[PDB]
Amino acid sequence: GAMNSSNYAELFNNDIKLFVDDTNVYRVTVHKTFEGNVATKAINGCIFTLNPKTGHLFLKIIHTSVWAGQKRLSQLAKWKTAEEVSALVRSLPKEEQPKQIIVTRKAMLDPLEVHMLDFPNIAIRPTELRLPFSAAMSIDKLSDVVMKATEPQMVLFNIYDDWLDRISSYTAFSRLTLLLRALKTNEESAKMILLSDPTITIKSYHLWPSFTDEQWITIESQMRDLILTEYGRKYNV
Amino acid sequence: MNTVPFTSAPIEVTIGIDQYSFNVKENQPFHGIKDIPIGHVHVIHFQHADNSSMRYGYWFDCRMGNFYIQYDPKDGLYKMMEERDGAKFENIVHNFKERQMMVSYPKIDEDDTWYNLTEFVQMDKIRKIVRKDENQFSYVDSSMTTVQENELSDPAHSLNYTVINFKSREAIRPGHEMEDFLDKSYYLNTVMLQGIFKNSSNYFGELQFAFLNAMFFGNYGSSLQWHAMIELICSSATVPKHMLDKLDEILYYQIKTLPEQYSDILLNERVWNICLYSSFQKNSLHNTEKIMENKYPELL
């Protein structure tokens, strides 16, 4: 059934699973036309497909050309997501295919189930968690590859960099969700926190800075303060 | 006109014949039902006074044999049987008519209700849904499950309705996943109508039969089947015009006939609201929508 607080640790067991997030697949800017009407312009998107145990991010870039001449794009976007996830699973060797796919929004369940009819043994599951994966486009290097794409394209990032050399996947996922939650609540402040110290750099093959264990504890503390803060600034507490 | 003789009525029972029904007291001198209209299937059904658990009954067509009811005190139910000795059957029927021990099938002349509920229902197709080929009549009861319910346990006592499943490889063509799921015309017209049922009459007959088993026996899997067959049509953008008009008539008489007090259990809010107000055919079921809105506006 649904993934929630009570079965959180299942994410880190040895059964292959993927999170799919479709919130950045169909993206638009809304603008005024010369006649003073409103129109949308699509911009490139991405499917966020994440193995929470290993940190594998299969980032499928959704080029604006896929929307050309299509109607009902928000509904198409869910089916396009499901089509690309199904294609990804089919591309993987049997022993790498997921046993479960957890979708972050319930509207993906039917599109994905229908596209995965060939895989009756892969469980398609919703979740009661409010995961912050929409903020993946606040990671500079992910946003950059998406916006620069001129064609459909799959890119692979370890979203945990080298963290698993030093910490568990449970802890790595908690750090990731904390960073993403912070970037979603206040991107500028979050990014200030991550980058204020010029001596701590981001390796060419990484997404996040090369913090020591001690510096991560400090970073993590600053991100929790931010999230608590914004929560007062928002609710006046 | 035809007759179904009843050996006797040893236990108190409510007897139904089609949409009619009457109360027979324990050992009351009840010997059957006469003046049954030839040309239609019929159903004779029972609810014991002592155990309203298990409504049960028999689908039959009087052209296919001489049938009678006789209580079995070992199995504890009224059983339909065929008498092959036609002389012995006319004789028994004539004696019971002379002694006026039979109730008359009480069809009002103006009234086409039963016809309209059974227009496409054919005993040959019933016998394929209800497998028991040594009898010419078909037993159904409240508890019998469908082949699809058994996939989700005694196969011999099952209702072998046509499996409809919208999230199935049968329903969904590779490469048209979104198209076929949102517009089920392929599944209706090619898979089901051309492929399995062969024509819309056989489709409507199974739909009507599922409704009638739902209503007369509270058979839950029959209700599931009836709603699924409605939904498949309503969820198809391309339906022959004649089928839409006939569907509206079929559903109209079903909704008309349903007991007001059973609407809460036999009517699926989601399917009806979807079919009447969201589906492709939301504007094509004028009679059904009018009677639904005037009779069960709560449901909507």
Ligand SMILES: CN(CCO)Cc1cc(N)ccc1Cl
């Ligand atoms: C780093 N490698 C890729 C190198 O091309 C492992 C990997 C595989 C998938 N499928 C996704 C992400 C990663 Cl990070």
Ligand SMILES: CN(CCO)Cc1cc(N)ccc1Cl
């Ligand atoms: C009561 N009748 C007459 C018995 O004398 C039993 C019966 C036997 C056959 N064979 C057919 C119908 C009936 Cl209803």
